[PDB]
Design a protein around this ligand. Structure first.
Ligand SMILES: [Zn+2]
Ligand SMILES: [Zn+2]
Lengths: 110, 328, 223, 99, 292
């Protein structure tokens, strides 16, 4: 689906809208795109550097700035602000798929 | 065509050593999941083909990226947000290709199994009904250090198929496979000198005693071939820095002072099942009678051998040869 | 049969001799393991040699068997003479002889030799000294072969077999009539190892015939 | 994902080609009529449920591989034949799909 | 030294060599001398190698069976032990005989350089049928120490059950991913898989048995009315049950007088259908090897 499709919710509530399988899948795809695409004014990918360094310290914490995601994809920011548990459950898998692109064995230890 | 060929070649060189390449994931059009599997397949095929050319692919977007391939249309790049990636690409002078342009680029820059073959494979290797990737049960798989003497076509038997458990190879002295431990005193290098050592004093004494006998024998050996290989003929010998048996002896004194029968290739399942049930409690093979014998002299006195001896119709060729060799 | 005081030879035992006149399927990855029950046959070779002299083509049971078992065997006799070890190849069985060829020439070298014959050989684990064999060749192998039995000190005192130790020592390290004997022995003694590497070639088609062995510069004075 | 049966799918392909390709010469005139498309058309107007296939017709295809595959492993290949017939009738006479 | 199968006195190597020598070097004049018939020895038939020509015509005709007379083993000197080993331990000695018959079939064209291909012969599974194993002592004069021995019996066939499929290979299919495995039977027991074999699919209890894909073999039960040579005082005739397998199915018709040589077997019988409880008193039957 599209971001404009996610702008208009078919369900009455946000809780069962994100819970829907196709909506969850396209939200996961958009979050993976957010981690892959985003870059700073300098030009380096801040999220790639964060993933590389958290793999370096073997730590499982990812620091995602909300302002970056708001200025990149605002509908996901509203979705995360209003229904945090369901968005964070998907975005955990998104972050693991992002860090799987560099370290295949990282899913084995953590 | 030649100028196009050289232009494509030197652009291949430049896109090899100075191009960072990034692929896009997001889509602008609502489209089905079963068609999304098609999108995943085309992305994976173009990935493996571009790996086949040998270009290294980085997963993350960056400012060092040169050419971007996207699924979204080339027409829409003008009418998008600043925060979108295509605006960043056109700002930083990056070339953007769609699958139409990229597939045209890849093609411009470069059998059915049939039913009878499938049924023939069905007869030999069983069903194709299961998952091919999973380990089939009635075929052994190696988990231990092995040697596997097989053939590619697999028409002939996997010839010598043998692995060892770590408990068997634990010993550093006896090993099932040969090791090059060399040795000394004319012995074979693989067995070595495990039984006894040549550094002992008594062994040195017996070797020196045999050496005394060998001097006279070795003198003619040196003298015959000193200058000529043939007998077309006092001796000169090269000094050596390395030690000797006599100097070591001197140092020790200073310290002191079946043909067999051919058998079938394949064995039976009941025969292999009987190997697990076995516990503990001059000779040769005659090919004329094609039997094993405990002793030769008992095989001489036997009805089949004596009946073979009295017959002369099986040495007829021999007989003809005898006759020829009589009047040569 | 060879007689020293006359210096000539003769051959017997032609009792085992004879004369000769002349892709991918999905699944069933047999390259990682053998079936538990065997139904396919084993190729009926002409395996009839003596232990330790059987050609590597004979070890792998080539259906079209050439003439060139004998030339590799005379190479083996040459290497035993130069190596000063008599029973140099001893085989408990066939695969023992395959590993015996592996520990001198290398796993990779015999895999390439196996490739032309149509069969692939894999060895997993198998700890030994030289992981890829000797890339230089047979020089360093016969070098430390003599070094062990020399430093032990059981070797006899005759300088008939000490010229090779000095010779091989200067290759691995790197009276006027004495210097003449030097340069002559140095030249043709380098030549015999040189002709030995072509005498030990794995591929029979690349392996030169005995007539080519006669016209080598090593055998000049007998002509 | 479910694992597919490559020989089963090719039996299905061969059967669905047989259902639309096979033909005989007319006895009275000599025209070339494809008898199984005619059978499907006959089922279309009477709403029949059963298609009758002569085995000698099936044996003429290839060198006999398809008929032998159907003969030895009929139980294994029967649903594949059913879905092949389903595809052929969908392509030709879709009104038999609904009922 | 020499290895012996546990519970027996049988060596595979020794029995193989002895039977190979017997097959290579038997003449029917030995059977003439053993039966005390010297005046009936003739040159043209007795002095010919019996089993050599029988295996040759076995090769020409495509026959996969050798009919072996056990008295011929007593005729040969080296196999007089093997004869007893055939009577006491048929189960493995017959397998030894089949394996060395296959070896002999290979050898007769390897040594003599025939034009027959080795692939067809080594694909074939040759099996032996011993017969004339001894005196025809009665069923009711046998003892539990005679279990799994070779026995020869007279009889009249009264009836036979229809062809019974006994299941040799089992075919299991996954319900969710349609992954299948085939498991061989092992002494009458088939191990059904608890988990799916696939790495991707490991669902528990997802394997179901498909009864028509799994391979079966023929088994028939024949009721035989025995006619012993010796009948004890007031012994009233009985019927035995004899089980024939594979090729021997439907070879005996109702009402024929036959010579059954087979293996004396005993199995426990379940007391109830729902329970796995077995009866301590065993049911005896004959596992038929050869029918004359
Ligand atoms: Zn003999
Ligand atoms: Zn499964």
């Amino acid at each position: 689906l599209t971001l404009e499709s996610l702008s208009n919710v078919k369900a009455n509530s946000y809780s069962e809208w994100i819970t829907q399988p196709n909506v969850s899948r396209t939200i996961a795809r958009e979050l993976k795109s957010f981690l892959l695409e985003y870059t700073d004014e300098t030009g380096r990918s801040v999220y790639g550097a964060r993933i590389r360094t958290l793999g370096e310290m073997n730590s499982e914490s990812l620091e995602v700035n909300y302002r970056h995601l708001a200025e990149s994809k605002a509908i996901l920011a509203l979705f995360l602000a209003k229904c945090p548990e369901e968005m964070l459950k998907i975005f955990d898998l998104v972050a693991m798929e992002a860090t799987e692109l560099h370290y295949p064995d990282y899913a084995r230890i953590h | 065509p030649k100028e196009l060929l050289e232009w494509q070649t030197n652009w291949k060189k430049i896109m090899k050593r100075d191009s960072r390449i990034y692929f896009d994931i997001t889509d602008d059009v609502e489209m089905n999941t079963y068609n999304k599997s098609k999108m995943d397949k085309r992305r994976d095929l173009l990935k493996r083909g571009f790996l086949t050319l040998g270009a290294q692919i980085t997963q993350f977007f960056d400012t060092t990226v040169t050419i971007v391939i996207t699924r979204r249309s080339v027409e829409n790049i003008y009418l998008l947000k600043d925060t979108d990636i295509l605006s960043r690409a056109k700002k930083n002078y990056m070339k953007v290709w769609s699958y139409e342009k990229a597939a045209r680029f890849l093609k411009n820059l470069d059998a059915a199994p049939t039913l009878s073959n499938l049924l023939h494979n069905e007869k030999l290797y069983g069903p194709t009904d299961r998952d091919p990737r999973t380990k089939r049960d009635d075929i052994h798989y190696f988990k231990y250090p092995h040697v596997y003497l097989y053939d590619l076509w697999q028409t002939w038997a996997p010839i010598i198929t043998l692995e060892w458990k770590p408990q068997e190879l634990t010993n550093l002295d006896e090993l099932p496979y040969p090791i090059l431990k060399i040795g000394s005193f004319g012995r074979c290098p693989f067995i070595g000198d495990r039984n006894y050592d040549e550094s002992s004093y008594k062994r040195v004494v017996k070797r020196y005693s045999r050496d005394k006998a060998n001097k006279k024998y070795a003198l003619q050996l040196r003298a015959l071939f000193q200058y000529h290989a043939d007998t077309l003929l006092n001796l000169i010998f090269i000094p050596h820095t390395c030690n000797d048996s006599t100097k070591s002896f001197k140092k020790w004194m200073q310290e002191k002072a079946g043909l067999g029968p051919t058998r079938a290739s394949v064995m039976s399942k009941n025969m292999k099942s009987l190997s697990r049930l076995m516990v503990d409690r001059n000779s040769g093979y005659c090919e004329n009678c094609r039997v094993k014998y405990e002793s030769l002299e008992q095989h001489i006195v036997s009805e089949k051998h004596l009946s073979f001896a009295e017959n002369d119709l099986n040495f007829e060729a021999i007989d003809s040869l005898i006759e020829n060799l009589r009047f040569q | 049969l060879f007689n020293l005081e006359l210096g000539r030879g003769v051959l017997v035992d032609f009792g085992l001799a004879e004369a000769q006149m002349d892709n991918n399927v999905n699944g069933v990855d047999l390259t990682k393991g053998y079936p538990k029950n065997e139904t396919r046959r084993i190729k009926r070779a002409n395996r009839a040699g003596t232990r330790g002299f059987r050609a590597p083509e004979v070890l792998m049971k080539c259906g079209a068997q050439s003439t060139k078992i004998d030339i590799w065997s005379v190479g083996v006799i040459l290497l035993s003479l130069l190596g000063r070890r008599f029973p140099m190849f001893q085989s408990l069985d066939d695969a023992d002889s395959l590993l015996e060829l592996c520990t001198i020439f290398g796993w990779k070298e015999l895999r390439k030799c196996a490739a032309l014959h149509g069969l692939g050989f894999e060895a997993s684990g198998l700890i030994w000294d030289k992981p890829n064999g000797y890339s230089n060749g047979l020089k360093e192998f016969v070098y430390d072969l003599l070094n062990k039995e020399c430093t032990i000190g059981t070797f006899p005192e005759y300088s008939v077999a000490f010229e090779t130790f000095g010779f091989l020592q200067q290759e691995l390290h790197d009276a006027y009539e004495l210097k003449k004997y030097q340069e002559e022995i140095w030249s043709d003694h380098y030549w015999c190892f040189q002709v030995l590497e072509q005498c030990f070639e794995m591929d029979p088609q690349k392996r030169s015939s005995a007539e080519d062995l006669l016209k080598t510069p090593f055998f000049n004075e007998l002509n | 994902k479910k694992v597919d049966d490559v020989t089963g799918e090719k039996v299905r392909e061969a059967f669905e080609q047989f259902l639309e390709d096979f033909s005989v010469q007319s006895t009275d005139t000599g025209e070339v009529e494809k008898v199984y498309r005619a059978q499907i058309e006959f089922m279309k107007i009477y709403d029949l449920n059963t298609i009758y296939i002569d085995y000698q017709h099936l044996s003429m295809r290839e060198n006999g591989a398809l008929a032998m595959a159907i003969s030895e492993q009929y139980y294994r290949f029967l649903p594949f034949l059913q879905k092949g017939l389903r595809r052929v009738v969908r392509k030709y006479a879709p009104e038999l799909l609904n009922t | 030294p020499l290895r012996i199968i546990w519970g027996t006195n049988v060596s595979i190597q020794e029995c193989t060599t002895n039977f190979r020598n017997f097959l290579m070097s038997f003449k029917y004049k030995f059977r003439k001398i053993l039966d005390e018939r010297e005046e009936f020895i003739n040159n043209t038939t007795d002095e010919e190698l019996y089993y050599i020509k029988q295996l040759n015509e076995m090769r020409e005709l495509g026959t996969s069976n050798l009919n072996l007379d056990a008295r011929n083993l007593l005729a040969y000197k080296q196999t007089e032990d093997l004869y007893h080993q055939l009577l006491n331990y048929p189960q493995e000695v017959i397998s030894i005989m089949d394996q060395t018959i296959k070896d002999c079939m290979v050898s007769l064209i390897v040594d003599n350089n025939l034009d027959y291909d080795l692939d067809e012969i080594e694909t074939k599974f040759y099996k032996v049928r011993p017969y004339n194993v001894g005196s025809c002592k009665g069923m009711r004069e046998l003892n539990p120490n005679d279990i799994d021995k070779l026995i020869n019996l007279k009889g009249l066939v009264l009836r036979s059950t229809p062809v019974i499929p006994d299941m040799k290979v089992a075919f299991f299919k996954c319900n969710v991913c349609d992954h299948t495995m085939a498991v061989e039977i092992d002494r009458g027991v088939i191990q059904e898989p608890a988990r799916c074999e696939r790495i991707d699919c490991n669902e528990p209890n997802s394997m179901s048995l498909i009864h028509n894909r799994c391979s079966f073999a023929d088994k028939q039960v024949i009721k035989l009315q025995e006619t012993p040579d010796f009948v004890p005082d007031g012994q009233t005739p009985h019927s035995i049950s004899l089980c024939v397998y594979d090729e021997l199915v439907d070879s005996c018709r109702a009402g024929d007088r036959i010579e059954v040589t087979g293996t004396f077997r005993s199995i426990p019988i379940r007391a109830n259908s729902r329970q796995r409880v077995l009866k301590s008193l065993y049911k005896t039957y004959v596992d038929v090897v050869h029918v004359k």
